[PDB]
């Protein structure tokens, strides 16, 4: 899809592996903010989204946390607390024809900038210091959308670039999509290293005696110490205590 009407698709309830992406697309840029890709194969996420569109080749940078330009003012903008990854691969072999590919356009004139992650597709003619031209174009009153007209001879920075963005939370909300890693039989009453659905720590696991309400997934004592957790396979509630220590 074009930038001014980017498309979003929710992907959840499945086993995601981010090792197959290296295949497709030479991947001129594949970078993440808030996670590092080699470790990305491990954690479990809340809800991962995928947005796809085509933009010019000097604007890829505009898709970044809180960067100003003209591709992230009224076109598409991501938040300042973004977490996730951005991906781009120069595709000048399937989207650029001879004479201008007048198939992808972007809003050049906007009244007010847009909040993160909203897209506007209304076609309206810009104003010119007077009741806006009702269908025509004067000094101003330009058409909101201007075609890119991609051609196969431009400099690389003007050739189009397909881009796709993944964005997901990590507050450990009910895991809906995890990496491949397999399960292991449970051990109780022994100081053991545990990895519960992404939450890593050490301590002794004991059958719990506190009543988790059915919509809850974690338990906390004072000071953010994860005090209890429910098993992601059998749903029995478990208590965590750090193994014995003291001074000598």
């Amino acid at each position: 899809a074009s930038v001014y009407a980017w498309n979003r698709k929710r992907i959840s309830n499945c086993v995601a592996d981010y090792s197959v992406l290296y295949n497709f697309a030479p991947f001129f840029a594949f970078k993440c903010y808030g996670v590092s890709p080699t470790k990305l194969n491990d954690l479990c996420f809340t809800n991962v989204y995928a947005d796809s569109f085509v933009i010019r080749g000097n604007e890829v940078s505009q898709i970044a946390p809180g960067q100003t330009g003209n591709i992230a003012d009224y076109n598409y903008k991501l938040p300042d607390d973004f977490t996730g990854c951005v991906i781009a691969w120069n595709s000048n072999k399937l989207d650029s024809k001879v004479g201008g590919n007048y198939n992808y356009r972007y809003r050049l004139f906007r009244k007010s900038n847009l909040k993160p992650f909203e897209r506007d597709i209304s076609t309206e003619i810009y104003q010119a210091g007077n009741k806006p031209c009702n269908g025509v174009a004067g000094v101003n009153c330009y058409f909101p959308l201007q075609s890119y007209g991609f051609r196969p001879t431009y400099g690389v920075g003007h050739q189009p670039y397909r881009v796709v963005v993944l964005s997901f939370e990590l507050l450990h909300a009910p895991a809906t999509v995890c990496g491949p890693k397999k399960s292991t039989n449970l051990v109780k009453n022994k100081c053991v290293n545990f990895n519960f659905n992404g939450l890593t720590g050490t301590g002794v696991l004991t059958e719990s005696n506190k009543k988790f309400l059915p919509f809850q997934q974690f338990g906390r004592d004072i000071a953010d110490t994860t005090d209890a957790v429910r098993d992601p396979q059998t749903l029995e509630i478990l208590d965590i205590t750090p193994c014995s220590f003291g001074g000598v």
Partner: antibody
Amino acid sequence: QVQLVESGGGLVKPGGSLRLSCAASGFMISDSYMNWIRQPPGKGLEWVSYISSNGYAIYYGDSVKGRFTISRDNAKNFLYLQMNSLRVEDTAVYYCAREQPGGYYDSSGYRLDPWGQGILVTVSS
Amino acid sequence: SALTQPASVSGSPGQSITISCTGTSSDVGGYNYVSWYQQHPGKAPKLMIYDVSNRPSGVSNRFSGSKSGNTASLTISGLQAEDEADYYCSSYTSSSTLYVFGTGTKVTVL
């Protein structure tokens, strides 16, 4: 199931003009990329023009360039092809065909599946 | 820039046929988007294969497309009766003009 019936062709004189109508049935012509295929008598097929779904990308055949305007009536839900300033070498049959991968996540190359019934045009004295 | 498709072929029920379809290094070679259509007399030409190995619905497995470098080649097995029809190899290109066509093949069975 999905039919593409044509209307508006027939005999004509050189110099005049004409209008072709492509009527889509079985699906919505307002969101499916189209393009016409003409076939002269006793030869293969040939590309004519192409409309996008957007409506903002239009690609004509190189010989009919400068003429043979195209548009869509999303009100009457048809396709119209007006042949303007015809010449003698343009006598042929014409087909109105729809591109298959009109979804948004197809991962499959293009292929013209639903064809138009097709009408012939004859331009001479 | 047009595809070169041969005239006609002939064989008896039980045999299998092939047909060559060349092109340049911009339409067939370099994009692998090529397709093949069939035409009985008096009907709009119908798709036989596209995406060479991608055989579409209804089509009898008897057809087998393949693309090597620039040349393309179809292979039809099990000579039946409906074969009486024209066959056109088409391709998606990248300069102006988005589709070119082959001369057309006549497949007749004895």
